Design a protein around this ligand. Structure first.
Ligand code: A1BFX
Length: 185
């Protein structure tokens, strides 16, 4: 892909984070803590899952960023509407305002409804995410495999400002503590 030139500097919004997440001082890394992280509750926080939004809101243009997923067993990545539900149980789907992919139990799937099997020969250590607001496109790239395409959502109906979306996943297994990291430009 030739999307690198639309690179944007993403930072995490502490106020949206699940109360168990630990966001680095530079707001570029997030991981699951082993307990509640001693923050007050607010209507922005994802309550049920280890999720957080980027601070940046996008309503036009072309945007690109990269995320490091090294050694994780489970995660969700992509973009979502600024108005997505924060409290209770929900599925990741375009109908709910999410355009995401994930790793879970040694398989990769796109967050369609129902979910779509992805075909990845080289397990990615870094993921590229490209958003074309006007075209209604969200694309995912395997940086580890020379930028190969993973998945394209097309004909997207964003229906509002978009925010970068992250889920570090649970760590029931003891093998998923590693952070998500926003990679340098
Ligand atoms: C998702 C976080 C943590 N959590 C858990 O239920 C949990 C599960 N294993 S450890 N923490 C809260 C009840 C909700 O916020």
């Amino acid at each position: 892909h030739h999307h690198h030139h639309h690179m944007v500097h993403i930072t995490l919004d502490r106020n949206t984070a699940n109360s168990w997440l630990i966001i680095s001082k530079d707001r570029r890394q997030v991981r699951m803590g082993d307990t509640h992280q001693n923050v007050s509750d607010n209507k922005e926080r994802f309550s049920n899952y280890p999720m957080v939004l980027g601070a940046q809101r996008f309503s036009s243009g072309k945007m690109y960023w990269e995320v490091d997923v090294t050694q994780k067993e489970a995660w969700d990545l992509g973009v979502c509407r600024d108005s997505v539900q924060r409290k209770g149980q929900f599925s990741l789907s375009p109908e709910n305002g999410f355009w995401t992919i994930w790793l879970w139990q040694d398989s990769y799937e796109a967050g369609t409804s129902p979910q779509t099997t992805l075909h990845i020969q080289v397990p990615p250590c870094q993921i590229g995410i490209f958003v074309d607001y006007e075209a209604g496109v969200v694309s995912f790239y395997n940086i580890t495999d020379h930028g190969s395409l993973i998945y394209t959502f097309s004909e997207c109906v964003f229906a509002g400002p978009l925010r970068p979306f992250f889920n570090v996943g649970f760590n029931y297994s003891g093998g998923n503590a590693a952070p998500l990291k926003l990679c340098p430009l």
